């Protein structure tokens, strides 16, 4: 959700959870 | 190359497209189910007359215009004409990806058609069956379908150009000492 490249995929999901991503390191 | 008369040829195309669309509308009116009268044929035409007319204008006008501008006749003009025709037909989708897809793909198909000779039957005189073939005689110029055992090196230098191994003189002969 947060970054431009995760947003650009929003049309590309249908019925996949739109997860807000968080870096595992943090 | 002497020019096409774009305006007159395109007007002819307009007439023919209008006629063909009218005929298609009449056939559409006769083949359909449900109530139909003599005026509903254009009402329930699906815009088919516009399809025919607009395609005719786009193709013929663009083809003649590109041919005159480049002063050539070849498959590229048909590529442009098909591009314009695909633009017209893809406008009906009302979507930009589909408009682009029609444009490029119709342009490519019509370029392929123009490259093969822009005909559906054959140019009989140019075909291999009606042409000089086999091995050429003593020192004749090689024609399109003919085969030789050795070509002239001057022809190779002209066609490929000099550089990256293509030379006017073989290397060992040129680097021989005296």
């Amino acid at each position: 959700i947060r970054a431009s490249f995760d947003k650009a995929e929003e049309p590309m999901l249908g019925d996949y959870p739109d997860i807000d991503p968080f870096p595992a390191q943090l | 190359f002497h020019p096409y008369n774009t305006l007159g040829l395109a007007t002819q195309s307009a007439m023919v497209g209008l006629g063909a669309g009218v005929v298609a509308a009449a056939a559409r009116n006769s083949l359909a189910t449900g109530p139909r009268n003599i005026l509903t044929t254009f009402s329930k035409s699906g815009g088919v007359v516009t399809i025919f007319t607009g395609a005719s204008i786009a193709y013929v006008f663009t083809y003649c215009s590109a041919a005159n501008l480049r002063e050539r006749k070849d498959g590229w003009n048909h590529m442009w004409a098909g591009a314009a025709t695909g633009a017209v037909l893809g406008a009906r989708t009302k979507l930009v990806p589909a408009f682009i897809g029609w444009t490029v793909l119709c342009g490519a198909a019509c370029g392929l058609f123009g490259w093969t000779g822009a005909r559906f039957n054959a140019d009989r005189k140019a075909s291999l069956e009606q042409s000089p073939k086999g091995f050429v005689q003593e020192d004749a110029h090689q024609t399109f379908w003919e085969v030789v055992h050795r070509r002239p090196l001057s022809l190779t230098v002209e066609q490929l150009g000099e550089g990256r191994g293509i030379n006017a003189v073989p290397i060992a002969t040129a680097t021989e000492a005296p």
Binding site: E9 | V16, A20, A27, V48, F52, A58, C106
Partner: protein
């Protein structure tokens, strides 16, 4: 590159786009005579339409072969799309 090109455009000019294209084209051609009830009447109308259209097309070709190319494109568009 991997999603938008390799699995985007390249599949569009490939299996996915060709599948969609052929689906619409095949549907249109088989439904060319879909809603009709009397096979006799419709098939007879088709033979009349074929004859008349071939005559007019050839007349156009005698005039100027370039003018007929858009008409054939439009006819193919009618049949398959």
């Amino acid at each position: 590159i991997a999603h938008h090109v390799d699995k985007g455009s390249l599949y569009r000019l490939g299996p996915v786009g060709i599948n969609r294209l052929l689906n619409k084209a095949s549907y249109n051609v088989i439904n060319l005579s879909s809603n009709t009830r009397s096979s006799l009447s419709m098939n007879s109308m088709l033979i009349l339409i074929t004859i008349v259209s071939l005559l007019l097309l050839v007349l156009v070709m005698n005039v100027n072969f370039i003018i007929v190319i858009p008409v054939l494109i439009s006819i193919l568009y009618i049949l398959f799309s």
